[PDB]
JSON list of C-alpha atoms in Angstrom, two decimals:
[
{"chain": "A", "resi": 2, "resn": "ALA", "atom": "CA", "xyz": [104.06, 154.36, -28.65]},
{"chain": "A", "resi": 3, "resn": "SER", "atom": "CA", "xyz": [106.92, 155.71, -26.54]},
{"chain": "A", "resi": 4, "resn": "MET", "atom": "CA", "xyz": [103.89, 156.63, -24.47]},
{"chain": "A", "resi": 5, "resn": "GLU", "atom": "CA", "xyz": [104.59, 153.42, -22.47]},
{"chain": "A", "resi": 6, "resn": "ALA", "atom": "CA", "xyz": [107.13, 154.85, -19.93]},
{"chain": "A", "resi": 7, "resn": "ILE", "atom": "CA", "xyz": [105.06, 157.98, -19.33]},
{"chain": "A", "resi": 8, "resn": "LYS", "atom": "CA", "xyz": [101.82, 155.93, -18.95]},
{"chain": "A", "resi": 9, "resn": "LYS", "atom": "CA", "xyz": [103.67, 153.62, -16.63]},
{"chain": "A", "resi": 10, "resn": "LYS", "atom": "CA", "xyz": [104.88, 156.54, -14.54]},
{"chain": "A", "resi": 11, "resn": "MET", "atom": "CA", "xyz": [101.51, 158.36, -14.12]},
{"chain": "A", "resi": 12, "resn": "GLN", "atom": "CA", "xyz": [100.41, 154.89, -13.02]},
{"chain": "A", "resi": 13, "resn": "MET", "atom": "CA", "xyz": [102.98, 154.74, -10.21]},
{"chain": "A", "resi": 14, "resn": "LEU", "atom": "CA", "xyz": [102.20, 158.35, -9.14]},
{"chain": "A", "resi": 15, "resn": "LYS", "atom": "CA", "xyz": [98.59, 157.40, -8.60]},
{"chain": "A", "resi": 16, "resn": "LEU", "atom": "CA", "xyz": [99.39, 154.27, -6.71]},
{"chain": "A", "resi": 17, "resn": "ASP", "atom": "CA", "xyz": [101.77, 156.26, -4.59]},
{"chain": "A", "resi": 18, "resn": "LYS", "atom": "CA", "xyz": [99.11, 158.72, -3.76]},
{"chain": "A", "resi": 19, "resn": "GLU", "atom": "CA", "xyz": [96.43, 156.18, -2.91]},
{"chain": "A", "resi": 20, "resn": "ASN", "atom": "CA", "xyz": [98.91, 154.27, -0.77]},
{"chain": "A", "resi": 21, "resn": "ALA", "atom": "CA", "xyz": [99.63, 157.50, 1.04]},
{"chain": "A", "resi": 22, "resn": "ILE", "atom": "CA", "xyz": [95.91, 158.22, 1.45]},
{"chain": "A", "resi": 23, "resn": "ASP", "atom": "CA", "xyz": [95.49, 154.73, 2.92]},
{"chain": "A", "resi": 24, "resn": "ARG", "atom": "CA", "xyz": [98.21, 155.52, 5.39]},
{"chain": "A", "resi": 25, "resn": "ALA", "atom": "CA", "xyz": [96.75, 158.88, 6.37]},
{"chain": "A", "resi": 26, "resn": "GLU", "atom": "CA", "xyz": [93.39, 157.33, 6.94]},
{"chain": "A", "resi": 27, "resn": "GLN", "atom": "CA", "xyz": [94.67, 154.52, 9.07]},
{"chain": "A", "resi": 28, "resn": "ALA", "atom": "CA", "xyz": [96.81, 156.87, 11.17]},
{"chain": "A", "resi": 29, "resn": "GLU", "atom": "CA", "xyz": [93.71, 158.98, 11.69]},
{"chain": "A", "resi": 30, "resn": "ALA", "atom": "CA", "xyz": [91.75, 155.95, 12.83]},
{"chain": "A", "resi": 31, "resn": "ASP", "atom": "CA", "xyz": [94.46, 155.12, 15.35]},
{"chain": "A", "resi": 32, "resn": "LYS", "atom": "CA", "xyz": [94.48, 158.62, 16.75]},
{"chain": "A", "resi": 33, "resn": "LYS", "atom": "CA", "xyz": [90.72, 158.53, 17.37]},
{"chain": "A", "resi": 34, "resn": "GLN", "atom": "CA", "xyz": [91.03, 155.40, 19.48]},
{"chain": "A", "resi": 35, "resn": "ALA", "atom": "CA", "xyz": [94.22, 156.52, 21.21]},
{"chain": "A", "resi": 36, "resn": "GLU", "atom": "CA", "xyz": [92.36, 159.76, 21.89]},
{"chain": "A", "resi": 37, "resn": "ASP", "atom": "CA", "xyz": [89.55, 157.82, 23.53]},
{"chain": "A", "resi": 38, "resn": "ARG", "atom": "CA", "xyz": [92.14, 155.78, 25.41]},
{"chain": "A", "resi": 39, "resn": "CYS", "atom": "CA", "xyz": [93.59, 159.17, 26.46]},
{"chain": "A", "resi": 40, "resn": "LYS", "atom": "CA", "xyz": [90.07, 160.39, 27.33]},
{"chain": "A", "resi": 41, "resn": "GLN", "atom": "CA", "xyz": [89.17, 157.30, 29.34]},
{"chain": "A", "resi": 42, "resn": "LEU", "atom": "CA", "xyz": [92.39, 157.34, 31.33]},
{"chain": "A", "resi": 43, "resn": "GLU", "atom": "CA", "xyz": [91.50, 160.87, 32.46]},
{"chain": "A", "resi": 44, "resn": "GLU", "atom": "CA", "xyz": [87.76, 160.22, 33.01]},
{"chain": "A", "resi": 45, "resn": "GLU", "atom": "CA", "xyz": [88.43, 157.06, 35.04]},
{"chain": "A", "resi": 46, "resn": "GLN", "atom": "CA", "xyz": [90.97, 159.09, 37.03]},
{"chain": "A", "resi": 47, "resn": "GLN", "atom": "CA", "xyz": [88.40, 161.73, 37.98]},
{"chain": "A", "resi": 48, "resn": "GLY", "atom": "CA", "xyz": [85.96, 159.12, 39.35]},
{"chain": "A", "resi": 49, "resn": "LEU", "atom": "CA", "xyz": [89.00, 157.91, 41.29]},
{"chain": "A", "resi": 50, "resn": "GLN", "atom": "CA", "xyz": [89.56, 161.36, 42.87]},
{"chain": "A", "resi": 51, "resn": "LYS", "atom": "CA", "xyz": [86.06, 161.34, 44.43]},
{"chain": "A", "resi": 52, "resn": "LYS", "atom": "CA", "xyz": [86.72, 157.90, 45.85]},
{"chain": "A", "resi": 53, "resn": "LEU", "atom": "CA", "xyz": [89.74, 159.56, 47.48]},
{"chain": "A", "resi": 54, "resn": "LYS", "atom": "CA", "xyz": [88.00, 162.48, 49.17]},
{"chain": "A", "resi": 55, "resn": "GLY", "atom": "CA", "xyz": [85.22, 160.07, 50.18]},
{"chain": "A", "resi": 56, "resn": "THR", "atom": "CA", "xyz": [87.84, 157.90, 51.87]},
{"chain": "A", "resi": 57, "resn": "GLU", "atom": "CA", "xyz": [89.96, 160.79, 53.22]},
{"chain": "A", "resi": 58, "resn": "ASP", "atom": "CA", "xyz": [86.77, 162.28, 54.67]},
{"chain": "A", "resi": 59, "resn": "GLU", "atom": "CA", "xyz": [86.13, 158.96, 56.41]},
{"chain": "A", "resi": 60, "resn": "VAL", "atom": "CA", "xyz": [89.65, 159.33, 57.84]},
{"chain": "A", "resi": 61, "resn": "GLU", "atom": "CA", "xyz": [88.48, 162.68, 59.21]},
{"chain": "A", "resi": 62, "resn": "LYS", "atom": "CA", "xyz": [85.45, 161.09, 60.95]},
{"chain": "A", "resi": 63, "resn": "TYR", "atom": "CA", "xyz": [87.47, 158.30, 62.54]},
{"chain": "A", "resi": 64, "resn": "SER", "atom": "CA", "xyz": [90.00, 160.68, 64.06]},
{"chain": "A", "resi": 65, "resn": "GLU", "atom": "CA", "xyz": [87.22, 162.63, 65.80]},
{"chain": "A", "resi": 66, "resn": "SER", "atom": "CA", "xyz": [85.71, 159.22, 66.70]},
{"chain": "A", "resi": 67, "resn": "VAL", "atom": "CA", "xyz": [88.96, 157.91, 68.25]},
{"chain": "A", "resi": 68, "resn": "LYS", "atom": "CA", "xyz": [89.55, 161.15, 70.14]},
{"chain": "A", "resi": 69, "resn": "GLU", "atom": "CA", "xyz": [86.07, 161.18, 71.69]},
{"chain": "A", "resi": 70, "resn": "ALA", "atom": "CA", "xyz": [86.56, 157.46, 72.42]},
{"chain": "A", "resi": 71, "resn": "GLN", "atom": "CA", "xyz": [89.96, 158.04, 74.07]},
{"chain": "A", "resi": 72, "resn": "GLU", "atom": "CA", "xyz": [88.40, 160.82, 76.16]},
{"chain": "A", "resi": 73, "resn": "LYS", "atom": "CA", "xyz": [85.48, 158.67, 77.35]},
{"chain": "A", "resi": 74, "resn": "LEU", "atom": "CA", "xyz": [88.05, 156.07, 78.27]},
{"chain": "A", "resi": 75, "resn": "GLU", "atom": "CA", "xyz": [90.17, 158.42, 80.41]},
{"chain": "A", "resi": 76, "resn": "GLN", "atom": "CA", "xyz": [86.97, 159.49, 82.19]},
{"chain": "A", "resi": 77, "resn": "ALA", "atom": "CA", "xyz": [86.02, 155.88, 82.89]},
{"chain": "A", "resi": 78, "resn": "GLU", "atom": "CA", "xyz": [89.50, 155.11, 84.18]},
{"chain": "A", "resi": 79, "resn": "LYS", "atom": "CA", "xyz": [89.36, 157.97, 86.69]},
{"chain": "A", "resi": 80, "resn": "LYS", "atom": "CA", "xyz": [85.99, 156.70, 87.88]},
{"chain": "A", "resi": 81, "resn": "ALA", "atom": "CA", "xyz": [87.18, 153.15, 88.40]},
{"chain": "A", "resi": 82, "resn": "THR", "atom": "CA", "xyz": [90.18, 154.49, 90.30]},
{"chain": "A", "resi": 83, "resn": "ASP", "atom": "CA", "xyz": [88.16, 156.76, 92.56]},
{"chain": "A", "resi": 84, "resn": "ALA", "atom": "CA", "xyz": [85.54, 154.07, 93.25]},
{"chain": "A", "resi": 85, "resn": "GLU", "atom": "CA", "xyz": [88.32, 151.71, 94.30]},
{"chain": "A", "resi": 86, "resn": "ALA", "atom": "CA", "xyz": [89.76, 154.35, 96.63]},
{"chain": "A", "resi": 87, "resn": "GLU", "atom": "CA", "xyz": [86.37, 154.69, 98.18]},
{"chain": "A", "resi": 88, "resn": "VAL", "atom": "CA", "xyz": [86.65, 151.00, 98.90]},
{"chain": "A", "resi": 89, "resn": "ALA", "atom": "CA", "xyz": [90.19, 151.27, 100.36]},
{"chain": "A", "resi": 90, "resn": "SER", "atom": "CA", "xyz": [89.27, 153.98, 102.84]},
{"chain": "A", "resi": 91, "resn": "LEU", "atom": "CA", "xyz": [86.18, 152.21, 104.02]},
{"chain": "A", "resi": 92, "resn": "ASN", "atom": "CA", "xyz": [88.55, 149.34, 104.71]},
{"chain": "A", "resi": 93, "resn": "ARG", "atom": "CA", "xyz": [90.87, 151.69, 106.49]},
{"chain": "A", "resi": 94, "resn": "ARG", "atom": "CA", "xyz": [88.32, 153.14, 108.88]},
{"chain": "A", "resi": 95, "resn": "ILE", "atom": "CA", "xyz": [86.79, 149.79, 109.67]},
{"chain": "A", "resi": 96, "resn": "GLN", "atom": "CA", "xyz": [90.15, 148.43, 110.68]},
{"chain": "A", "resi": 97, "resn": "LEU", "atom": "CA", "xyz": [90.68, 151.48, 112.94]},
{"chain": "A", "resi": 98, "resn": "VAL", "atom": "CA", "xyz": [87.46, 151.35, 114.94]},
{"chain": "A", "resi": 99, "resn": "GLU", "atom": "CA", "xyz": [88.20, 147.74, 115.26]},
{"chain": "A", "resi": 100, "resn": "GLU", "atom": "CA", "xyz": [90.70, 148.86, 117.91]},
{"chain": "A", "resi": 101, "resn": "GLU", "atom": "CA", "xyz": [89.89, 151.95, 119.97]},
{"chain": "B", "resi": 14, "resn": "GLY", "atom": "CA", "xyz": [102.72, 168.75, -32.68]},
{"chain": "B", "resi": 15, "resn": "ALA", "atom": "CA", "xyz": [101.07, 168.10, -29.33]},
{"chain": "B", "resi": 16, "resn": "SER", "atom": "CA", "xyz": [103.10, 169.79, -26.64]},
{"chain": "B", "resi": 17, "resn": "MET", "atom": "CA", "xyz": [103.51, 167.58, -23.63]},
{"chain": "B", "resi": 18, "resn": "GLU", "atom": "CA", "xyz": [102.15, 170.48, -21.61]},
{"chain": "B", "resi": 19, "resn": "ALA", "atom": "CA", "xyz": [98.99, 168.82, -20.36]},
{"chain": "B", "resi": 20, "resn": "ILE", "atom": "CA", "xyz": [100.81, 165.55, -19.67]},
{"chain": "B", "resi": 21, "resn": "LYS", "atom": "CA", "xyz": [103.47, 167.12, -17.46]},
{"chain": "B", "resi": 22, "resn": "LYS", "atom": "CA", "xyz": [100.78, 169.30, -15.84]},
{"chain": "B", "resi": 23, "resn": "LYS", "atom": "CA", "xyz": [98.87, 166.16, -14.86]},
{"chain": "B", "resi": 24, "resn": "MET", "atom": "CA", "xyz": [101.93, 164.56, -13.50]},
{"chain": "B", "resi": 25, "resn": "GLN", "atom": "CA", "xyz": [102.74, 167.45, -11.26]},
{"chain": "B", "resi": 26, "resn": "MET", "atom": "CA", "xyz": [99.20, 167.31, -9.83]},
{"chain": "B", "resi": 27, "resn": "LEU", "atom": "CA", "xyz": [99.55, 163.65, -9.02]},
{"chain": "B", "resi": 28, "resn": "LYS", "atom": "CA", "xyz": [102.84, 164.43, -7.27]},
{"chain": "B", "resi": 29, "resn": "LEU", "atom": "CA", "xyz": [101.32, 167.25, -5.36]},
{"chain": "B", "resi": 30, "resn": "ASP", "atom": "CA", "xyz": [98.46, 165.00, -4.24]},
{"chain": "B", "resi": 31, "resn": "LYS", "atom": "CA", "xyz": [100.80, 162.35, -3.12]},
{"chain": "B", "resi": 32, "resn": "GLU", "atom": "CA", "xyz": [102.77, 165.00, -1.25]},
{"chain": "B", "resi": 33, "resn": "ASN", "atom": "CA", "xyz": [99.66, 166.41, 0.44]},
{"chain": "B", "resi": 34, "resn": "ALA", "atom": "CA", "xyz": [98.64, 162.91, 1.58]},
{"chain": "B", "resi": 35, "resn": "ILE", "atom": "CA", "xyz": [102.02, 162.18, 2.99]},
{"chain": "B", "resi": 36, "resn": "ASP", "atom": "CA", "xyz": [101.88, 165.36, 5.04]},
{"chain": "B", "resi": 37, "resn": "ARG", "atom": "CA", "xyz": [98.47, 164.22, 6.26]},
{"chain": "B", "resi": 38, "resn": "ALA", "atom": "CA", "xyz": [99.75, 160.78, 7.27]},
{"chain": "B", "resi": 39, "resn": "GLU", "atom": "CA", "xyz": [102.74, 162.05, 9.16]},
{"chain": "B", "resi": 40, "resn": "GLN", "atom": "CA", "xyz": [100.81, 164.63, 11.12]},
{"chain": "B", "resi": 41, "resn": "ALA", "atom": "CA", "xyz": [98.23, 162.04, 12.04]},
{"chain": "B", "resi": 42, "resn": "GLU", "atom": "CA", "xyz": [101.03, 159.65, 13.01]},
{"chain": "B", "resi": 43, "resn": "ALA", "atom": "CA", "xyz": [102.72, 162.28, 15.18]},
{"chain": "B", "resi": 44, "resn": "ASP", "atom": "CA", "xyz": [99.37, 163.05, 16.76]},
{"chain": "B", "resi": 45, "resn": "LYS", "atom": "CA", "xyz": [98.82, 159.38, 17.36]},
{"chain": "B", "resi": 46, "resn": "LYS", "atom": "CA", "xyz": [102.04, 159.40, 19.37]},
{"chain": "B", "resi": 47, "resn": "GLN", "atom": "CA", "xyz": [100.82, 162.43, 21.33]},
{"chain": "B", "resi": 48, "resn": "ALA", "atom": "CA", "xyz": [97.87, 160.46, 22.67]},
{"chain": "B", "resi": 49, "resn": "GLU", "atom": "CA", "xyz": [99.77, 157.25, 23.29]},
{"chain": "B", "resi": 50, "resn": "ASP", "atom": "CA", "xyz": [102.30, 159.24, 25.36]},
{"chain": "B", "resi": 51, "resn": "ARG", "atom": "CA", "xyz": [99.46, 160.67, 27.49]},
{"chain": "B", "resi": 52, "resn": "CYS", "atom": "CA", "xyz": [97.94, 157.19, 27.69]},
{"chain": "B", "resi": 53, "resn": "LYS", "atom": "CA", "xyz": [101.25, 155.86, 29.01]},
{"chain": "B", "resi": 54, "resn": "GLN", "atom": "CA", "xyz": [101.02, 158.73, 31.53]},
{"chain": "B", "resi": 55, "resn": "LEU", "atom": "CA", "xyz": [97.59, 158.30, 33.09]},
{"chain": "B", "resi": 56, "resn": "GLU", "atom": "CA", "xyz": [97.55, 154.53, 33.27]},
{"chain": "B", "resi": 57, "resn": "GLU", "atom": "CA", "xyz": [100.66, 155.15, 35.36]},
{"chain": "B", "resi": 58, "resn": "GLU", "atom": "CA", "xyz": [99.03, 158.03, 37.30]},
{"chain": "B", "resi": 59, "resn": "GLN", "atom": "CA", "xyz": [95.93, 155.79, 37.81]},
{"chain": "B", "resi": 60, "resn": "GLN", "atom": "CA", "xyz": [98.25, 153.11, 39.19]},
{"chain": "B", "resi": 61, "resn": "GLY", "atom": "CA", "xyz": [99.72, 155.82, 41.44]},
{"chain": "B", "resi": 62, "resn": "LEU", "atom": "CA", "xyz": [96.36, 157.01, 42.77]},
{"chain": "B", "resi": 63, "resn": "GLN", "atom": "CA", "xyz": [95.35, 153.51, 43.90]},
{"chain": "B", "resi": 64, "resn": "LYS", "atom": "CA", "xyz": [98.53, 152.93, 45.91]},
{"chain": "B", "resi": 65, "resn": "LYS", "atom": "CA", "xyz": [98.10, 156.26, 47.71]},
{"chain": "B", "resi": 66, "resn": "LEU", "atom": "CA", "xyz": [94.48, 155.19, 48.01]},
{"chain": "B", "resi": 67, "resn": "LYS", "atom": "CA", "xyz": [94.96, 151.69, 49.39]},
{"chain": "B", "resi": 68, "resn": "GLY", "atom": "CA", "xyz": [97.38, 153.18, 51.93]},
{"chain": "B", "resi": 69, "resn": "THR", "atom": "CA", "xyz": [94.70, 155.73, 52.76]},
{"chain": "B", "resi": 70, "resn": "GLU", "atom": "CA", "xyz": [92.28, 152.81, 53.29]},
{"chain": "B", "resi": 71, "resn": "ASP", "atom": "CA", "xyz": [95.10, 151.07, 55.20]},
{"chain": "B", "resi": 72, "resn": "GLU", "atom": "CA", "xyz": [95.31, 154.15, 57.43]},
{"chain": "B", "resi": 73, "resn": "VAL", "atom": "CA", "xyz": [91.51, 154.10, 57.89]},
{"chain": "B", "resi": 74, "resn": "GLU", "atom": "CA", "xyz": [91.46, 150.47, 59.01]},
{"chain": "B", "resi": 75, "resn": "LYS", "atom": "CA", "xyz": [94.22, 151.25, 61.53]},
{"chain": "B", "resi": 76, "resn": "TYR", "atom": "CA", "xyz": [91.80, 153.86, 62.93]},
{"chain": "B", "resi": 77, "resn": "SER", "atom": "CA", "xyz": [88.90, 151.40, 63.25]},
{"chain": "B", "resi": 78, "resn": "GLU", "atom": "CA", "xyz": [90.66, 148.78, 65.36]},
{"chain": "B", "resi": 79, "resn": "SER", "atom": "CA", "xyz": [91.96, 151.63, 67.55]},
{"chain": "B", "resi": 80, "resn": "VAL", "atom": "CA", "xyz": [88.35, 152.85, 68.05]},
{"chain": "B", "resi": 81, "resn": "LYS", "atom": "CA", "xyz": [87.22, 149.30, 68.90]},
{"chain": "B", "resi": 82, "resn": "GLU", "atom": "CA", "xyz": [90.23, 148.78, 71.16]},
{"chain": "B", "resi": 83, "resn": "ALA", "atom": "CA", "xyz": [89.00, 151.73, 73.26]},
{"chain": "B", "resi": 84, "resn": "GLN", "atom": "CA", "xyz": [85.39, 150.47, 73.08]},
{"chain": "B", "resi": 85, "resn": "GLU", "atom": "CA", "xyz": [86.52, 147.31, 74.88]},
{"chain": "B", "resi": 86, "resn": "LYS", "atom": "CA", "xyz": [88.84, 148.95, 77.41]},
{"chain": "B", "resi": 87, "resn": "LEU", "atom": "CA", "xyz": [85.90, 151.17, 78.24]},
{"chain": "B", "resi": 88, "resn": "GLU", "atom": "CA", "xyz": [83.83, 148.03, 78.85]},
{"chain": "B", "resi": 89, "resn": "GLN", "atom": "CA", "xyz": [86.55, 146.82, 81.23]},
{"chain": "B", "resi": 90, "resn": "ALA", "atom": "CA", "xyz": [86.76, 150.20, 82.89]},
{"chain": "B", "resi": 91, "resn": "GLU", "atom": "CA", "xyz": [83.05, 150.06, 83.66]},
{"chain": "B", "resi": 92, "resn": "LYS", "atom": "CA", "xyz": [82.90, 146.56, 84.97]},
{"chain": "B", "resi": 93, "resn": "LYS", "atom": "CA", "xyz": [85.71, 147.78, 87.18]},
{"chain": "B", "resi": 94, "resn": "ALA", "atom": "CA", "xyz": [83.86, 150.84, 88.40]},
{"chain": "B", "resi": 95, "resn": "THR", "atom": "CA", "xyz": [80.60, 148.96, 88.91]},
{"chain": "B", "resi": 96, "resn": "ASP", "atom": "CA", "xyz": [82.24, 146.16, 90.86]},
{"chain": "B", "resi": 97, "resn": "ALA", "atom": "CA", "xyz": [84.20, 148.57, 93.08]},
{"chain": "B", "resi": 98, "resn": "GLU", "atom": "CA", "xyz": [80.89, 150.36, 93.74]},
{"chain": "B", "resi": 99, "resn": "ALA", "atom": "CA", "xyz": [78.94, 147.26, 94.64]},
{"chain": "B", "resi": 100, "resn": "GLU", "atom": "CA", "xyz": [81.63, 146.68, 97.17]},
{"chain": "B", "resi": 101, "resn": "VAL", "atom": "CA", "xyz": [81.28, 150.02, 98.91]},
{"chain": "B", "resi": 102, "resn": "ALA", "atom": "CA", "xyz": [77.54, 149.43, 98.93]},
{"chain": "B", "resi": 103, "resn": "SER", "atom": "CA", "xyz": [78.01, 146.09, 100.59]},
{"chain": "B", "resi": 104, "resn": "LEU", "atom": "CA", "xyz": [80.38, 147.53, 103.20]},
{"chain": "B", "resi": 105, "resn": "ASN", "atom": "CA", "xyz": [77.75, 150.21, 103.87]},
{"chain": "B", "resi": 106, "resn": "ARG", "atom": "CA", "xyz": [74.95, 147.69, 104.33]},
{"chain": "B", "resi": 107, "resn": "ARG", "atom": "CA", "xyz": [77.18, 145.86, 106.81]},
{"chain": "B", "resi": 108, "resn": "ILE", "atom": "CA", "xyz": [78.13, 148.85, 108.82]},
{"chain": "B", "resi": 109, "resn": "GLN", "atom": "CA", "xyz": [74.49, 149.78, 109.07]},
{"chain": "B", "resi": 110, "resn": "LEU", "atom": "CA", "xyz": [73.60, 146.31, 110.40]},
{"chain": "B", "resi": 111, "resn": "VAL", "atom": "CA", "xyz": [76.31, 146.40, 113.01]},
{"chain": "B", "resi": 112, "resn": "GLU", "atom": "CA", "xyz": [75.34, 149.83, 114.32]},
{"chain": "B", "resi": 113, "resn": "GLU", "atom": "CA", "xyz": [71.78, 148.53, 114.53]},
{"chain": "B", "resi": 114, "resn": "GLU", "atom": "CA", "xyz": [72.52, 145.55, 116.72]}
]
């Protein structure tokens, strides 16, 4: 049978095709995992955003904390200063009467 | 005799099938590269976020010591006021005694 080279060639066409199907299938498997990798890298990111606002909103608090704190401090410093001037003047008048 | 008609017909199908599968593989493969490009993008963007973020936390710490710095100086400022005060009070008590005797 000169059917041998034909036979042999339909053989190879089939092999070719199933090798290609194997390849398609494996590429498709890879995509599905890469696509979850893709997915996860975005979904993790989002969670990260909310960590950021949470933190940046703490920043906001602290600034209005520091400011109020600075302000209390200026107010205390004026008080100390005025109380000490009350002391200086009392000194001053005592040393005067001392001598007239 | 038997034309080869059905044999060459069957061969062309097998070729077509092989061709269809190859198309399939190379689109999937190209698509696989789509995703891996994006992957190589976010992992890098994720890395980016955290550095901005740690620096944001680094800013926030800087604004906690500063708060507590003022807390203390305020403590000092009071002790100072209260001591100055006790002193005028003591001078007052003394003047009163003198004028009384």
